[PDB]
Design a protein around this ligand. Sequence first.
Ligand code: DWG
Ligand code: DWG
Ligand code: CA
Ligand code: CA
Lengths: 416, 416
Amino acid sequence: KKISGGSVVEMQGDEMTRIIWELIKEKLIFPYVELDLHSYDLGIENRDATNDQVTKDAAEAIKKHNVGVKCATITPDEKRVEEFKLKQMWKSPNGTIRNILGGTVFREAIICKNIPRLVSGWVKPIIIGRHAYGDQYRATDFVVPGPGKVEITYTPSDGTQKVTYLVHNFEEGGGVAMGMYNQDKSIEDFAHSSFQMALSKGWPLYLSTKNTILKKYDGRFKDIFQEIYDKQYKSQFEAQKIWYEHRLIDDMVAQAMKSEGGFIWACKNYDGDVQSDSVAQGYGSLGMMTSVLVCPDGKTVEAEAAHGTVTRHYRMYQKGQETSTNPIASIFAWTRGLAHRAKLDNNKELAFFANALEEVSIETIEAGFMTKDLAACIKGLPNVQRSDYLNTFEFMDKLGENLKIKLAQAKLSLEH
Amino acid sequence: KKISGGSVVEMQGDEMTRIIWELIKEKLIFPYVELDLHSYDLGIENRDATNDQVTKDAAEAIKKHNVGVKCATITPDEKRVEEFKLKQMWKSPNGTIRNILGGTVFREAIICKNIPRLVSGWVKPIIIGRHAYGDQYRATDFVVPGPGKVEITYTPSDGTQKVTYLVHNFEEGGGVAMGMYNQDKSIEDFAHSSFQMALSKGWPLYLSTKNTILKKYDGRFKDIFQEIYDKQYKSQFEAQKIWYEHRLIDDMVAQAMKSEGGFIWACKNYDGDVQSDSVAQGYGSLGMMTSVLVCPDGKTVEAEAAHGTVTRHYRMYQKGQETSTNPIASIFAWTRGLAHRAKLDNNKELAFFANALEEVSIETIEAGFMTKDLAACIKGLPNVQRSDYLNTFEFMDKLGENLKIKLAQAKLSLEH
Ligand SMILES: *[C@H]1[C@@H](C#N)C(=O)[C@@H](C)[C@@H]2CCc3cnc(Nc4ccccc4)nc3[C@@]12c1ccccc1
Ligand SMILES: C[C@@H]1C(=O)[C@H](C#N)C[C@]2(c3ccccc3)c3nc(Nc4ccccc4)ncc3CC[C@@H]12
Ligand SMILES: [Ca+2]
Ligand SMILES: [Ca+2]
C-alpha cells in the first residue's frame, strides 16, 4: 500500500531537468506515493505545437487542483528559435503562469552544513518574498525607429476624461520605450503574504523599493505596505518582538550583504528575480534553492525548480558523455508541493514523506555523497577527482537507497 | 605658494556629508591647492529656494569647465517634504545632472589590505560601468485611480506609421503605471565607453540585461553592444586575450558572486545603482567606493560620493554628542576630480597632489587609524570600543597630519 497523495498538477520541462524530473518521479515519488497526476508538457516542442496554450491550461488546472509542481523550462531567444525551428519566440512560461495565478514567490536557500557559503556572515536564512505579478514581466516594450513622440495615456472606464503623459520626444534618432503597470489588489495581497510569512517565522520584514526615483509607482508599494502594517499587523509584530521596515533597494542589498540573515525580504518582481539568484549563490550554490508561489486565495500553490535547464550537461548527455547534475531543487519542488497538498487534505503520511525526502536529500550530501558541482564547491573544480562525486544516475540511486532506508526505519518505529 | 589648481565645479550637499565636505576642503585641499572654485549649493534648502534651478545651473557649469566634484544630496520623498516644508517633491539632483551630461558612471571599491571582504573570492577588482542616462531615472510614473485603459503610443514626426499598444485594462480598482525610454545615441556612447574601459584595464567585459523578458527594450542594448564589438573592438580584445559577453542579469549577479573579480561590468542605469552598492559592500564598505561620471565627449567628468548623507550621525551631531563618519569616498571625489583637472591642464603638481592624498587615505587606514564604522568591519559592532576608532574630527586631523608629512618628504626628495 502506497500513500494516497491526491491531486497534483505537474509541468514537464526541458533538456537536463526534463531527464532528471522523470528519474525523481520513478525513483523517489511513485514507489511510495499514489497521486491523481494532471500532467502538462511545458517542453519547448509542446509549447510550440500548442501555440503556448498548454502553459495557460496548466495554470487553469493549478487553480482547480490547488497544487502545481514545475520542472525548469526554456524561455526561447533567437538561437532557440533556430535550434527548434519555432513558429514564434514564446514568452516565459513562468511569467504566463504567475500572471494568471498571482501572489508571492517565496525563495529560500537549501542549506547543507558541509557546503561553504560565499558570504561569511550568513549564519541564519534569508527568505525572499518576490511579488509574482506585473512590472517588467507584463510590460509593453518596443523599438522606437526614429524621431517622434512616445506618450502614455490613462482613460477612466467612465470616458469622462483622458490623461496624456509625454514619455519622450525623440528629436534625432530612435531608441526604445516601454509601458508597465501593477494593480492595487495584487500589491495588497503581496503585503499580506509578506506580513504573514514574517509572523510565521518570527523574523523581521523589510520591503525594498526605489520610491525616491519612482515617487508614484514605488511610492504606492511603500504606502500600501505601511497602511496594512499600522492597521492590521503592527501589534502582532510587537508581541513577537519583530518589526516591519521600508528600505531603498540600493541600501537593502548592502544591508542584506553585511547581515547575519534571519529576515523576510519583500521584493518587487524584478528585484526578487535578481536578488534571489545573488542570495542563492551567496549561500553556496545557485541550484540549492526552494521557490514556491503562494497565491492570494490562501489555498493554491505552485512549487518550482527556479534554476536553468542545464544545457551544457544536456549536450554532454546527448553525446553519451558522463554527467553529474544536482537534482535537489527539482526534488524540493516535489516535496514543497506534496507538503502543501498534505496540509490541504490533512494527510499526515504524505506530510511525513515530504519532510523525510527533504531530510534524506540534505543527509546524503552532508555524508559526502554528491554531484560534481557540489564537490567543486568544497574542493574547487581543478582539485576535483572522479572519486569525489557521483554521476546523475549514481546520485539518484544513492538518494533512492537512503530514502528506502529512512522510510523503512519510520515504519519499523511504529508502536504495536 | 599653493598649487595652481584651475577651474573646478563643486556641488555642496546635505547633512553629515555636508559637514565632512567643509572639513575636507579646510584640512586637505585649501591649505595646498588654490582653485578657481565654481560653487553651487545643492543643499535641500537652497534647491527649494531656487526651485531646483541651482542643480541645472551646476550641470551647465560642468559642461563649461569639464570637471565637477559632488557631495551627497537628499532626494526628497513625502517625509523629507514634511521635514523641510518643501514647495515640491524635488527630483534627484544626480538624475538631473546625469540626464544633462549623459555618459557612464564608473564605480570601483577603494581597497585597504587590513579590511576583510564579505566575499572571500574577490581577489581582483570589479569595475561597474553604470549607464548614466534614462530608464527609471527619466521615467513617467503615475497612480491609476480606478478602472480604465492605460495605453502607450508612438507618433513618428516623419515616419512609416504611428501605433497604439494597450499596456493594461484595469477592470476592477486601480494601481500604478509608468512609461520609460532610452536613446540609441546614448546606448552607443555607453557601449564605446564600456569597450574602451575594458581595453584600458586589460579585463574582459560583461553586459547584463533581461532581454528574455524585455525582448525589444533590452534586446536593443544587446544588439548595439554586439554590433559595436564585432565591427570596432573584437580584434583589439583578442590581441589582449580578453572578451566581451552578454549575460542575463540574474545569471550575472550569481557569476559575479562566485568569481575572483577582474572584469568590467556594463550595467543598465537601475542595475548599476543596485549592483554598485552590493559590490562595494562585498569588498568591505559602502564608504569605500569611487564614482566617476565619464561624459561621451571624453573631456568632461563628474566625481561624487555615491553613498547617502548619513542622517543618523547628523542627528547625533545635532544633539551635540560625538560622531565618527567615514570620509574616504568624499575625499576620493575630490582627488578623482582634481586628477582629471590635472590631466586636462598638463599639471604635474596637481597630478602629484591628487595621488598623494589617495595614498595618505589608504596608508592611514592600513596603519590601524579609522572611523567607528570601519572598526565595525574588522571587529563587528558589539565588540567595537572607543579605543578602536577616531571621531570624525580626529580621523580628519590624522589624515591632515599624514598628508603634511607625505608632501614635505616629497618636496625634500626633489633633485637639483
Ligand atoms: C555611525 C556611528 C557613529 N558615530 C553610530 O553610532 C551609529 C548610530 C551609526 C549608524 C548609521 C551609520 C551610517 N553610516 C555610517 N557611516 C558611513 C556609511 C556609508 C558611507 C560613509 C559613512 N555610520 C553609521 C554609524 C555606524 C554604523 C555601523 C557601525 C558603526 C557605526
Ligand atoms: C562542463 C561542466 C561539467 O563537466 C559538469 C558535469 N557533468 C557540470 C558543470 C559544472 C561542474 C562543476 C563545476 C562547475 C560546473 C555544470 N553544472 C551545473 N549544475 C547545475 C545543476 C542543477 C542546477 C543548476 C546547476 N550547471 C552548469 C554546469 C556547466 C559546466 C559543467
Ligand atoms: Ca532568475
Ligand atoms: Ca545607490
